[PDB]
Amino acid sequence: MHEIVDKNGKKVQKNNLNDEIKIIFTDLDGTLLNSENKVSEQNLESLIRAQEKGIKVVIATGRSIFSVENVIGEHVKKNRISLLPGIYMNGCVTFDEKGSRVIDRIMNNDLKMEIHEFSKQINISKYAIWFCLEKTYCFEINDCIREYMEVEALNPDVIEDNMLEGLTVYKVLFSLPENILENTLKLCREKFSHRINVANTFQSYVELFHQHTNKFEGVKEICKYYNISLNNALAMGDGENDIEMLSGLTHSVGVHNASEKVKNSAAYVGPSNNEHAISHVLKTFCDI
Numbered sequence: 425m426h427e428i429v430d431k432n433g434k435k436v437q438k439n440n441l442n443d444e445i446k447i448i449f450t451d452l453d454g455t456l457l458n459s460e461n462k463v464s465e466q467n468l469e470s471l472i473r474a475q476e477k478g479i480k481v482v483i484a485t486g487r488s489i490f491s492v493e494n495v496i497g498e499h500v501k502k503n504r505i506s507l508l509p510g511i512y513m514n515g516c517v518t519f520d521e522k523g524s525r526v527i528d529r530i531m532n533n534d535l536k537m538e539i540h541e542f543s544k545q546i547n548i549s550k551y552a553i554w555f556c557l558e559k560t561y562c563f564e565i566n567d568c569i570r571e572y573m574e575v576e577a578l579n580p581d582v583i584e585d586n587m588l589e590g591l592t593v594y595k596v597l598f599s600l601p602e603n604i605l606e607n608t609l610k611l612c613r614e615k616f617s618h619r620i621n622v623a624n625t626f627q628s629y630v631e632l633f634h635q636h637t638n639k640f641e642g643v644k645e646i647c648k649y650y651n652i653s654l655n656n657a658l659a660m661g662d663g664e665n666d667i668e669m670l671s672g673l674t675h676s677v678g679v680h681n682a683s684e685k686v687k688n689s690a691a692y693v694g695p696s697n698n699e700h701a702i703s704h705v706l707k708t709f710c711d712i
């Protein structure tokens with residue numbers, strides 16, 4: 425499966441498009457990266473041609489820039505994928521090309537502690553990874569924290585419970601067991617509606633971050649930087665934390681592996697992340 429189709433299942437054709445796509449925003453895990461957390465050669469080959477044609481490709485991830493650099497560092501070192509500008513921590517940390525934070529949305533400290541106390545009260549504090557600007561922290565290590573470290577490719581430093589109060593954080597990620605994902609998700613959303621964003625971003629990850637921030641806020645700021653109209657931008661993703669940027673832009677692609685809620689928010693449905701998604705996006709929308 426290597427096609428991109430609209431809501432009616434009709435293939436998108438370049439000659440039918442009246443908008444030049446100048447910039448592509450793409451999620452990392454589950455979108456650009458395959459199940460092996462690698463950039464396929466087909467994708468890599470298309471990204472090279474994109475640079476040649478001056479098409480900007482921007483990462484839009486819940487990850488920090490640091491963990492991203494650890495996963496695709498080889499591609500960054502060869503200047504084949506730029507991390508700046510980039511949208512990180514679900515928009516809460518969005519950088520321009522100068523590494524300046526055009527969005528810097530820290531979590532309120534009272535809310536931080538309330539989330540923390542709540543997590544301990546329901547015993548998911550052990551699964552919590554707290555994100556500062558430069559470092560991540562946890563309170564213990566278990567099979568679920570282990571599972572997080574392996575995929576994230578950047579280990580949190582272990583700290584005591586009392587230390588969280590002194591930290592300035594942007595988000596918390598709960599690497600939960602699959603057997604308490606659904607219920608824990610209800611409790612967080614019930615407890616913290618109109619207080620903080622709650623999203624099941626990847627596998628059994630539950631991320632909490634600034635209520636009025638998301639990836640699409642990052643998209644708007646970066647498009648504004650380069651004087652690019654949103655109509656000349658394209659977003660692609662697979663997760664709940666991509667919904668805002670997929671529905672916010674006229675041109676957006678939900679990869680096949682995405683859920684139905686995610687696909688419905690996107691303008692188009694494309695190949696899975698294991699099927700060289702961005703390669704085909706670049707073909708259809710930018711003519712290679």
Ligand SMILES: [Cl-]
Binds near residue numbers: 452453663
């Ligand atoms: Cl993500």
Ligand SMILES: [Mg+2]
Binds near residue numbers: 451453454625661662
């Ligand atoms: Mg994803």
